[PDB]
Amino acid sequence: TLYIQGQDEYYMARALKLAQRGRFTTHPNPNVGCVIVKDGEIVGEGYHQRAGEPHAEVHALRMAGEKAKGATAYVTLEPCSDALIAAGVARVVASMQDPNPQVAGRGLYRLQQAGIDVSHGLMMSEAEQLNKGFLKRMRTGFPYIQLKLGASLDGRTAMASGESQWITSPQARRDVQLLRAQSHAILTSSATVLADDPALTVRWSELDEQTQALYPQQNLRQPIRIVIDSQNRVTPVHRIVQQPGETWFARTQEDSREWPETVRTLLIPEHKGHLDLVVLMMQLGKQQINSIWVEAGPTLAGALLQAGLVDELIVYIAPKLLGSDARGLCTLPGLEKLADAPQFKFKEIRHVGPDVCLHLVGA
Amino acid sequence: TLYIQGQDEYYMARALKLAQRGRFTTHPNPNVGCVIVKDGEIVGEGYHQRAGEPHAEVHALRMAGEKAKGATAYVTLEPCPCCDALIAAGVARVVASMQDPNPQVAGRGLYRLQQAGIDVSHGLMMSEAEQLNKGFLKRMRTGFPYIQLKLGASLDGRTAMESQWITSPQARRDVQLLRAQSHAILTSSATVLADDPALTVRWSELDEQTQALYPQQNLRQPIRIVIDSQNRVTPVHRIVQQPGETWFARTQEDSREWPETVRTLLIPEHKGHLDLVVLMMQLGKQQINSIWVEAGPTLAGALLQAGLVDELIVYIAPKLLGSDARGLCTLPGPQFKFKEIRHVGPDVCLHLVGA
């Protein structure tokens, strides 16, 4: 009646902390933790690591063996739609009950047919936070979008018009690598590719102590690189396409040149002489992208904000002031209905070396 | 002797806390706190309240009376008449957090007491004490006021802070708090002509410090300083009809009748503009400890380019304001480092310092 809940919250927390270990590698699959308990002891633990790799339940089940019979399997996300039954468990505690299918949304009850005690809703908020992007793609058709911005004190960027993105500091660079690494994809404009010739990869060495936990060097997963170039200005000789992993171009007309194996291309309709960002997002949704980290110059960020597609703002502020000639999405207007678009609230603020990071979500 | 270090730390902390109670009403005098201890018991406490009123040590000594005879006084600033009071009330030991900065020739205060057979030290929490009087200490050391430049911003850098600010109540309350502790508030005539502000502290807009020092009848209106080199401000603008003084930084004498509480400061031009450096120097001679700047982009920028800004206080609103209302600075061309950052209602406030 009472101590059961006290213990329930203990083991679910444990199952949630395991699910997290998969957040770098799991895409397009969600994160899932599973903890099997018999007589106050964990007989089996597991989390989903990679799309083709075994489910969390499978991992924990293999571990528990015949010791599973007893009772209580703590899961992060409703199973099925199986082995949990064939390994005769009693009680199962689910945190969440399966997003989109909705037609198949109580495979939770399939275990009840086997006489298995079930229940859901434990720390559902935390399990929600754990799969923000995946869960968004399922409910809506849209990937979850984090917009990174490098600004000075007076708003403003890079001192020059060039759509080149300001990195503000090495610490801010190190901080972005970690956020990059849990994104399904990274998005940028062809202008940024032309102005910076960047790799837009994750570099394992730039990660910290999450180095120790999962993500050993060999497991490193490169987020999918997405480039917007309607006018096909990016060359097959640009660094970005030479990096390991796929790189997808969002272009208007198919490119005639010879591009590396890893290079793909999505054709996107226009909207007032410009590539339609809303269509593209949705298109990326169909293509199973959970979450996008955007390395935007002035134009891209503005267009995303005005299209109401951004879920989160991450603003890195350098302790500098910039002159008139400084570009800045800031002082320099361009946009009209930002005041009348999904507004954001502050969520976290932190020092990041000489910079500060302002974390904003639409909320 | 480690427990004595522990006791000293406690009593100095307390003296610092006491000193802080005068931060709203002490200008041009520093904030000073004193705690007298007589074998383990606090027998006298005191802090400075106002330039007209007595020094912290005198308050504390008055409370201790005969109890001061025994031993230790904790002062947050070396004492300087007022040094006879300490010697006359035969203390053993005074512990000062820092020595006087006015200048390095004044540092004699402690040596005066040591001749009387008092065991003296200095340096204990000389850092907190330093933070206690930034403006005053800077003036004494460099005849310049400590300048704090406030800025109000949307996420897209657009000037978004005029009392109906697109920022927030909480942020408006915060500014009042910070205004309340500046010796002076400085603005441009451009802001005066545009907004017609009072530039005062409204006591009701304060919180729990309502109860501290600072009952409503002790309200000290910070000195209003306005830059109009072209004498465009009028004697009928709200700012001059407020309690307290307003000082006009002028290039040339105005000819109109102004209330008795108004002054002008004649400031030379430097290449076509009023020389801000000389103004700050002159505000220094005028004993201005500290200046809270509430302006617009032009002035915010001239101060920044002159090298006169000691700290930035940047309020950012979680609003997105593209074309609405302009940018924060002009900068036709110091640098900064972040200190405290904090939430203020739905806004964030980022503090920065020169170095």
From Swiss-Prot, chain B:
Cofactor: Zn(2+)
Residues noted as binding NADP(+) in the record, renumbered to the chain: T159, A160, M161, W165, T191, D195, S229, G296, P297, T298, L299
Entry's family note: In the N-terminal section; belongs to the cytidine and deoxycytidylate deaminase family. In the C-terminal section; belongs to the HTP reductase family.
Catalyzed reactions: 2,5-diamino-6-hydroxy-4-(5-phosphoribosylamino)-pyrimidine + H2O + H(+) = 5-amino-6-(5-phospho-D-ribosylamino)uracil + NH4(+); 5-amino-6-(5-phospho-D-ribitylamino)uracil + NADP(+) = 5-amino-6-(5-phospho-D-ribosylamino)uracil + NADPH + H(+)
Gene: ribD
Binding site for substrate: S163, R179, L199, R202, E294
Name of the protein in its database record: Riboflavin biosynthesis protein RibD
CDD domains named among the record's database cross-references: Riboflavin_deaminase-reductase
